[PDB]
Design a protein around this motif. Sequence first.
Motif, PDB file in Angstrom:
ATOM      1  N   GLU A 137     102.341 -51.269  -6.723  1.00 19.10           N
ATOM      2  CA  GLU A 137     101.909 -50.432  -5.601  1.00 19.10           C
ATOM      3  C   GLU A 137     102.367 -48.985  -5.770  1.00 19.10           C
ATOM      4  OE1 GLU A 137     103.289 -52.125  -1.950  1.00 19.10           O
ATOM      5  OE2 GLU A 137     101.683 -53.620  -1.829  1.00 19.10           O
ATOM      6  N   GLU A 138     103.652 -48.795  -6.080  1.00 12.55           N
ATOM      7  CA  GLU A 138     104.189 -47.439  -6.212  1.00 12.55           C
ATOM      8  C   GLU A 138     103.567 -46.671  -7.376  1.00 12.55           C
ATOM      9  OE1 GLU A 138     105.882 -45.707  -3.915  1.00 12.55           O
ATOM     10  OE2 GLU A 138     105.609 -47.531  -2.726  1.00 12.55           O
ATOM     11  N   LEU A 139     103.265 -47.376  -8.461  1.00 11.79           N
ATOM     12  CA  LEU A 139     102.584 -46.767  -9.609  1.00 11.79           C
ATOM     13  C   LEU A 139     101.155 -46.338  -9.256  1.00 11.79           C
ATOM     14  CD1 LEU A 139     103.805 -49.008 -12.576  1.00 11.79           C
ATOM     15  CD2 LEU A 139     104.354 -46.573 -12.212  1.00 11.79           C
ATOM     16  N   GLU A 140     100.436 -47.170  -8.503  1.00 11.62           N
ATOM     17  CA  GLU A 140      99.078 -46.808  -8.068  1.00 11.62           C
ATOM     18  C   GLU A 140      99.067 -45.568  -7.162  1.00 11.62           C
ATOM     19  OE1 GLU A 140      96.317 -48.173  -9.262  1.00 11.62           O
ATOM     20  OE2 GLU A 140      94.960 -46.933  -8.054  1.00 11.62           O
ATOM     21  N   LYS A 141     100.084 -45.437  -6.318  1.00 11.71           N
ATOM     22  CA  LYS A 141     100.213 -44.250  -5.463  1.00 11.71           C
ATOM     23  C   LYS A 141     100.338 -42.978  -6.307  1.00 11.71           C
ATOM     24  CE  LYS A 141     102.422 -46.898  -1.711  1.00 11.71           C
ATOM     25  NZ  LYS A 141     103.638 -47.069  -0.854  1.00 11.71           N
ATOM     26  N   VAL A 142     100.899 -43.097  -7.517  1.00 13.62           N
ATOM     27  CA  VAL A 142     100.801 -42.004  -8.496  1.00 13.62           C
ATOM     28  C   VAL A 142      99.354 -41.952  -9.015  1.00 13.62           C
ATOM     29  CG1 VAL A 142     101.692 -40.855 -10.549  1.00 13.62           C
ATOM     30  CG2 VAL A 142     103.236 -42.306  -9.193  1.00 13.62           C
ATOM     31  N   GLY A 143      98.882 -43.043  -9.615  1.00 10.09           N
ATOM     32  CA  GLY A 143      97.485 -43.090 -10.040  1.00 10.09           C
ATOM     33  C   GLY A 143      97.116 -44.315 -10.838  1.00 10.09           C
ATOM     34  N   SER A 144      95.810 -44.576 -10.913  1.00  9.21           N
ATOM     35  CA  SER A 144      95.287 -45.780 -11.562  1.00  9.21           C
ATOM     36  C   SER A 144      95.479 -45.833 -13.079  1.00  9.21           C
ATOM     37  CB  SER A 144      93.798 -45.929 -11.238  1.00  9.21           C
ATOM     38  OG  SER A 144      93.604 -46.001  -9.840  1.00  9.21           O
ATOM     39  N   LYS A 197      90.281 -43.643 -28.679  1.00  5.84           N
ATOM     40  CA  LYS A 197      90.401 -43.770 -27.238  1.00  5.84           C
ATOM     41  C   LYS A 197      89.010 -43.610 -26.613  1.00  5.84           C
ATOM     42  CE  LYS A 197      92.355 -42.229 -22.999  1.00  5.84           C
ATOM     43  NZ  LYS A 197      91.413 -41.269 -22.366  1.00  5.84           N
ATOM     44  N   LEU A 198      88.623 -44.592 -25.802  1.00  2.00           N
ATOM     45  CA  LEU A 198      87.316 -44.580 -25.157  1.00  2.00           C
ATOM     46  C   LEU A 198      87.229 -43.501 -24.083  1.00  2.00           C
ATOM     47  CD1 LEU A 198      86.810 -48.444 -24.952  1.00  2.00           C
ATOM     48  CD2 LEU A 198      85.541 -46.853 -26.428  1.00  2.00           C
ATOM     49  N   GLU A 199      86.094 -42.805 -24.045  1.00  3.94           N
ATOM     50  CA  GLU A 199      85.835 -41.806 -23.011  1.00  3.94           C
ATOM     51  C   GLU A 199      85.252 -42.533 -21.807  1.00  3.94           C
ATOM     52  OE1 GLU A 199      83.646 -38.262 -23.879  1.00  3.94           O
ATOM     53  OE2 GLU A 199      84.934 -37.626 -25.537  1.00  3.94           O
ATOM     54  N   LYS A 200      85.973 -42.493 -20.687  1.00  3.76           N
ATOM     55  CA  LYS A 200      85.604 -43.266 -19.492  1.00  3.76           C
ATOM     56  C   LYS A 200      85.320 -42.360 -18.287  1.00  3.76           C
ATOM     57  CE  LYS A 200      89.658 -45.057 -19.777  1.00  3.76           C
ATOM     58  NZ  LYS A 200      90.897 -45.799 -19.455  1.00  3.76           N
ATOM     59  N   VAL A 201      84.657 -42.912 -17.277  1.00  4.02           N
ATOM     60  CA  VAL A 201      84.393 -42.177 -16.027  1.00  4.02           C
ATOM     61  C   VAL A 201      85.705 -41.749 -15.354  1.00  4.02           C
ATOM     62  CG1 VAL A 201      83.516 -42.438 -13.640  1.00  4.02           C
ATOM     63  CG2 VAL A 201      82.106 -43.181 -15.603  1.00  4.02           C
ATOM     64  N   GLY A 202      86.707 -42.617 -15.423  1.00  3.16           N
ATOM     65  CA  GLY A 202      88.033 -42.316 -14.881  1.00  3.16           C
ATOM     66  C   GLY A 202      89.093 -43.064 -15.662  1.00  3.16           C
ATOM     67  N   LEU A 203      90.246 -43.283 -15.030  1.00  2.35           N
ATOM     68  CA  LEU A 203      91.436 -43.831 -15.704  1.00  2.35           C
ATOM     69  C   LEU A 203      91.697 -43.036 -16.984  1.00  2.35           C
ATOM     70  CD1 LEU A 203      90.999 -46.105 -13.555  1.00  2.35           C
ATOM     71  CD2 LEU A 203      91.647 -47.753 -15.316  1.00  2.35           C
ATOM     72  N   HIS A 204      91.636 -41.716 -16.845  1.00  4.23           N
ATOM     73  CA  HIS A 204      91.670 -40.816 -17.989  1.00  4.23           C
ATOM     74  C   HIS A 204      92.964 -40.870 -18.808  1.00  4.23           C
ATOM     75  CE1 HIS A 204      88.040 -38.106 -16.715  1.00  4.23           C
ATOM     76  NE2 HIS A 204      87.667 -39.223 -17.317  1.00  4.23           N
ATOM     77  N   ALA A 205      94.075 -41.258 -18.184  1.00  7.29           N
ATOM     78  CA  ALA A 205      95.347 -41.374 -18.910  1.00  7.29           C
ATOM     79  C   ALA A 205      95.638 -42.793 -19.413  1.00  7.29           C
ATOM     80  CB  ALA A 205      96.504 -40.832 -18.078  1.00  7.29           C
ATOM     81  N   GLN A 206      94.703 -43.717 -19.192  1.00  4.37           N
ATOM     82  CA  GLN A 206      94.845 -45.080 -19.703  1.00  4.37           C
ATOM     83  C   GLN A 206      94.161 -45.180 -21.062  1.00  4.37           C
ATOM     84  OE1 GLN A 206      94.725 -48.390 -20.727  1.00  4.37           O
ATOM     85  NE2 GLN A 206      96.840 -48.078 -20.054  1.00  4.37           N
TER      86      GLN A 206
END
Lengths: 380, 377, 380, 377
Positions: free
Chosen positions: D72-79, D197-206
Amino acid sequence: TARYLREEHHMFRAAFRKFLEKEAYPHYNDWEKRGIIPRSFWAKMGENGFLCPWVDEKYGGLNADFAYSVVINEELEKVGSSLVGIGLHNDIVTPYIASYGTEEQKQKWLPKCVTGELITAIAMTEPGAGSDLANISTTAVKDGDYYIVNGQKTFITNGIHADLIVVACKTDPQAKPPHRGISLLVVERDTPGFTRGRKLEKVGLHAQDTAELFFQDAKVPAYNLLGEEGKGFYYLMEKLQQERLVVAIAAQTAAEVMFSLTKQYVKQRTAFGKRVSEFQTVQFRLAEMATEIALGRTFVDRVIEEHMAGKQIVTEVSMAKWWITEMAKRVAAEAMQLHGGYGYMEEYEIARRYRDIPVSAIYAGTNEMMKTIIARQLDL
Amino acid sequence: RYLREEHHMFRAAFRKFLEKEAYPHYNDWEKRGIIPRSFWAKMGENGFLCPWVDEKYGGLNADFAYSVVINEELEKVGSSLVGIGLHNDIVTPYIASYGTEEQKQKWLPKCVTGELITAIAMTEPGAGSDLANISTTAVKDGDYYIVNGQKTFITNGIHADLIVVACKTDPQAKPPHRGISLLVVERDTPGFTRGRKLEKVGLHAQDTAELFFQDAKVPAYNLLGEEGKGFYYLMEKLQQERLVVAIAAQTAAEVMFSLTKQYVKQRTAFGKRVSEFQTVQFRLAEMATEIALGRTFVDRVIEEHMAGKQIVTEVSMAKWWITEMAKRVAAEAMQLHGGYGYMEEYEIARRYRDIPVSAIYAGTNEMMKTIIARQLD
Amino acid sequence: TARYLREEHHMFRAAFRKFLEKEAYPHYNDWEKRGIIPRSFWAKMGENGFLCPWVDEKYGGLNADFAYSVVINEELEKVGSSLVGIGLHNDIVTPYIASYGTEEQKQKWLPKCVTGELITAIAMTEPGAGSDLANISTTAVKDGDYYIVNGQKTFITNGIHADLIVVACKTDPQAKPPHRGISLLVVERDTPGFTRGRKLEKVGLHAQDTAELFFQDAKVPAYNLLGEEGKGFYYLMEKLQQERLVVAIAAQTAAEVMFSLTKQYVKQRTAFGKRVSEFQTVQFRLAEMATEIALGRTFVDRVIEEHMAGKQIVTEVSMAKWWITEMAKRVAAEAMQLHGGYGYMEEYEIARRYRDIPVSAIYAGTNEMMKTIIARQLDL
Amino acid sequence: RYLREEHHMFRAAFRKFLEKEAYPHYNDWEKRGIIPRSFWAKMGENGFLCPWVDEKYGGLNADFAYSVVINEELEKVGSSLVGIGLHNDIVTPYIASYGTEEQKQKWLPKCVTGELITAIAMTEPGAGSDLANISTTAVKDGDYYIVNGQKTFITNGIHADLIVVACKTDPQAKPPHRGISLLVVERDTPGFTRGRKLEKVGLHAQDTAELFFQDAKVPAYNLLGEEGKGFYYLMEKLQQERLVVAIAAQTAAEVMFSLTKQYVKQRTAFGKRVSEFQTVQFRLAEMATEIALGRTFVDRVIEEHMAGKQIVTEVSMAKWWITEMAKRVAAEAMQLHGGYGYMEEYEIARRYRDIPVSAIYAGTNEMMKTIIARQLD
Ligand SMILES: Cc1cc2nc3c(=O)[nH]c(=O)nc-3n(C[C@H](O)[C@H](O)[C@H](O)COP(=O)(O)OP(=O)(O)OC[C@H]3O[C@@H](n4cnc5c(N)ncnc54)[C@H](O)[C@@H]3O)c2cc1C
Ligand SMILES: Cc1cc2nc3c(=O)[nH]c(=O)nc-3n(C[C@H](O)[C@H](O)[C@H](O)COP(=O)(O)OP(=O)(O)OC[C@H]3O[C@@H](n4cnc5c(N)ncnc54)[C@H](O)[C@@H]3O)c2cc1C
Ligand SMILES: Cc1cc2nc3c(=O)[nH]c(=O)nc-3n(C[C@H](O)[C@H](O)[C@H](O)COP(=O)(O)OP(=O)(O)OC[C@H]3O[C@@H](n4cnc5c(N)ncnc54)[C@H](O)[C@@H]3O)c2cc1C
Ligand SMILES: Cc1cc2nc3c(=O)[nH]c(=O)nc-3n(C[C@H](O)[C@H](O)[C@H](O)COP(=O)(O)OP(=O)(O)OC[C@H]3O[C@@H](n4cnc5c(N)ncnc54)[C@H](O)[C@@H]3O)c2cc1C
């Protein structure tokens, strides 16, 4: 504006509305109580030229175009959905007689369909099969100059009044595919072996005489075969385009009526020192209803035009049927809610409109069948 | 988590009672437009009325979970039985909470037995949602109140022998809500008359009626609580009222789901069970999901309520969301039955007609969203 | 079929598509990377007659009807939403010059708008006000032969390329009502005191050069006043009908494109020994998308016809704008999901289409403003 | 009800850590397309990686509620931080559940420290939902497996030093799923390469990537569990996987709601706060309601899961419904920000791009409805 109506249709609408203002609007609630619309009403419709107006002058008709039927069905829905039996007679059943009947059959039946001396019905659906029409099991076995008919039909509109019933039956139950064994047979009132059930108690359409039909060794003259043996399924598939269009037209009108009821109600109801129509959520809900109604009206009007031009529009009519019926259901739900407690009271017209609408998503082919047809036409 | 073994045993016993006394007769009651007082009497003698009432008045000191079981089991018979839940869990709690020792002694025993059936009258032709704007007046002419006004949509409006009436004892209160009192009006009060049973879309066996007060002479000792504090009593009790509606709607959704699932599993088309077509499977999966969400939510609200915590926001959420969900379930249920869903011989037709009013009473769903928005600051 | 297209428009569409197949389709991804579409593309558009084709022949135009603009904007959207700046130049901004400009102004500006030597933009929105346009605070104070302009405009399409900017400003901030103090003033490139922000980083429309504009004592010739002082709000309200129609057209096309992408994908993807398009839920989802697309297409086509006939259709265009944009958003959500993991990959075109669509519900007036307008027209 | 005081204290401390080590750097990580290993190291040294791991390997024997707090706390930073939850609660549990004593000793200590980051590779270009139809082969050539195939969309695909790979050790298994095993592939395995690294719509740092096996030589002692029982291990562990996704989506919805509520309360138009217009109030009330439903439901599922009960239906319900709800919240959030919702300078833009993939991974929402329908019988 939609291009299928000219001045003559506009004067006709006014004349027909004048008839209904006397003969239908004030009587409708009584008809619902009785569970049936009196034969005398059909007789009045016939004598005034409002039955089968498209029929040729030589049978007593008016050679009217389809726009006259649009007007009739819209104006009847403005009264109430229990009047659907007229549109069924005019625009669903009697066209089978005109399209597929012999000269002898047309001469025998069409004049009385115009006058209302003969009321028509169509019987496809059975206890075991509705959507899956190819799986009907009513049989008609040839015996001399007669067909011996055995089976049961269910949910038949005009089930009590009907004097002529177009019956889908299997003249060859062993045919491959099953649908190639289907024929259309006209069954007349007082046919030996033909009986009718008590009128069905339904959620709504309370003044429509819906009933089951029973054929126990029904002795039907071979003369009464409509078209060719084993081609019955083809006639049905062909005519269902107009059938679905008629349902779409009635549902569109019902939505328009229900919107008008709701708008007028909230404009006159006060709460919290304001007219209810002054609250922004009410304004937006009405704006959304108005938008969807405008979409349905524009689409159905275009489909009417295509239909009248003689074009094959199976996809578009299926679209119109499912989407407009669902839209009208949503309108009805919004309308009841916006009336508060009053929308649940039978003294308010919206209650009846609400009970009447949801069946439109079921008959003339369920909305699931409409989506099936669309997907097939999309090539998937 | 609020149900213990005693509640499971009670559920079975109450259901057995209803299989004898209610299920076989419900369709007849609907045709009659009323549930006979004889049924209420059987409920009372078996301890199924106001079970939470202290033993000293003849109650059982039962916790709220017993009321949950009763109301759920009654809904499984049908929504026209909501009058019992209203008696048990809506109106009689006003008498226990705000009644003097003398009023409780006079009224609560007979509410437990069912000799007196209760009703509450807030809504007027001119005002429902806007309850602060009620205009029914109660003017003191010691030792009586002279009552003038009209109340609309009253549940148990025909049967009720005691009616808790919201009225303005000071119509010049400014702020207006400060002039509201609760006044108990007894059967056969002079100038108190009732309208005909209202013809409704559903709840056909529930006797809903309008009430009329034309210089009605009401004894001043029938005042409930203090003058001018009626609005406060109402806002307080509306949390349990809204919870009761949410519980009944949740149960209706579950019933309608079960009817639909059973139907589509037995009905065949195109060489398959209707339940085998993927779209039907997904529709049922979505209904099951929303039903599970509502059940989990209402159960948690019940727990919080029983813990004595203020649940204004949560109960308002439960009320609007579950009633809308139940309505969606109803629409799916009719459609998935085909023509049979429209036939009155099929139970789903009646369930369908019964459900939409749940979005309206105990306060409209628009009023629920208004409350939630206020709490969101 | 929709009646506004004749054979000439059909041959034009093919010719324009041929141009785009060389000049736009293969370059689009590079343009997004750079964050701007090169000036050379506009120059090619101008020389081929695809800019302001409705402009009179005497300024170098083609006297084309609005159906040509419909074709251009549809075909450009088929490439991508970053091309909206062309439709803005053609059909939103330059019409202000033609409608409200003096002969001198039209002569000075229109020829270069046709060739693409001058690119146009319109600047209404400010940091403090978008929907509430009457509350803009950019001022233009008369000083001799000049207006001294102070203020900030935000989200300006063609914000970097634009050489002519139609600016809404308050020439009288104290006017009652506030909207009567608004005027339109043309601001030219290299105006002293006029600067531009860095291109805005957005969720999508990555090749559209959206930027903020800054006026710090901008010295604008009084000659550049468009129309009458204090009538600016009236010009805006009038032209927003066409503006909203253009947005509705682009969103309708985007939905049609996204549907085609999804249908083709699921027809070729296999899972569980079947094409994904063979699962009934996929078939119905596509059938539902197809239905809503058909509704939007029929409605927008009717509105185009009304518009071209010179009719005032404020309600219907507001309906078209909000409903079609929401519908296209729903299409996009379905499309991403039906692609599985691939719909989230930027290598697949659907990802970009998905990011591009949701802003259509915001610009040219939010969908909340569209519902506000509709409710007002319903009289509540 | 699964959070005790120790968990509340832990939440505060972990948040403090993230306010220093994560929040200020997130936008930079997104620009880089990866979260630096240095962050993973800080997480490990502070005991925020695999806290449930037995103390004997260097873990804390922490219960699942600690994992809930962390995720939960990690998601509050970001996905883009979902890789940590995947390491902690998705992949490493495979090693603890099915690893030999020797494998656990070799791997679990370094998973706790973050020296080894984990990934799991099921999906192939040709098969995702249809997992039984995977074609990656692992053929024994003692004492090695020779692995051939391709895996797609692998979370932690670049960082991962240990990858749990689903492969067919018997491609002629009939029934096919009986030929599936799990094989641990280590960094620098011969014939094992990774895509860009795959170029995605989001989750840019994953760091999502494809994995390639071309006659990859994998030691046979890297087999996890028994040959041919891989499918069973996967079906077992997917319940916690789906729960983790539901928790993250629930948290994203809450974050996006808060952003939206704050925005509309500070933004004015037509002489009012945007939050004062009735339609905005009702939209926010509806979002708050659905968020409350999801929170209550996921919390109950967590409780059931921690009680060791089988929650297949319930977790599938939570996964699809909450991800769809979070998507609806996102769409409302962008709209209610106006033009600013479309600007990358505003956090809501990134939240919007991040959310829709939650409906796709851990099994598509269509697969969730398929499971629910199967359980409905
Ligand atoms: C008021 C009324 C009047 C009527 N009048 C007439 C009349 O005059 N003449 C006449 O012939 N009939 C009449 N009918 C019958 C009507 O057309 C049928 O009810 C309708 O076609 C559906 O058939 P069914 O009731 O047997 O439902 P079923 O065919 O049993 O279907 C039940 C449900 O299963 C769904 N379903 C079935 N197959 C699939 C599938 N492949 N995929 C997804 N879902 C599926 C259906 O959509 C429906 O929701 C009338 C019905 C009503 C309600
Ligand atoms: C079966 C039934 C039983 C009932 N039993 C009882 C009972 O036992 N005791 C009792 O006191 N009452 C009872 N009622 C009354 C019920 O609580 C009211 O109908 C309800 O509170 C709504 O009031 P109304 O009908 O006057 O609708 P109104 O208050 O007139 O509202 C009508 C519509 O206007 C809308 N509206 C009003 N204000 C706003 C606003 N500010 N913003 C947006 N929309 C607004 C609402 O959407 C509502 O849909 C019963 C009603 C029914 C139907
Ligand atoms: C890609 C892009 C390009 C653009 N290009 C241009 C351009 O070229 N020229 C130009 O002038 N502008 C341009 N804009 C601005 C655009 O028109 C505005 O963003 C839009 O009008 C909304 O204004 P706003 O952003 O200030 O939102 P606001 O007006 O602040 O509104 C924020 C939210 O509150 C809601 N709201 C406001 N009032 C009410 C109410 N009364 N009732 C219910 N809800 C309400 C809105 O609907 C919205 O959802 C562009 C914007 C974008 C995103
Ligand atoms: C950001 C991200 C990270 C990921 N990380 C991992 C990871 O770490 N490890 C891993 O193993 N995988 C991972 N994946 C893969 C992910 O689990 C898959 O994308 C997902 O399971 C769907 O598989 P697919 O993409 O091949 O879609 P497909 O299986 O090809 O399905 C595409 C569409 O077809 C539809 N469909 C398929 N079958 C049916 C059916 N029978 N009925 C109705 N509709 C159907 C579904 O609606 C779906 O929308 C990741 C994906 C993403 C996007």
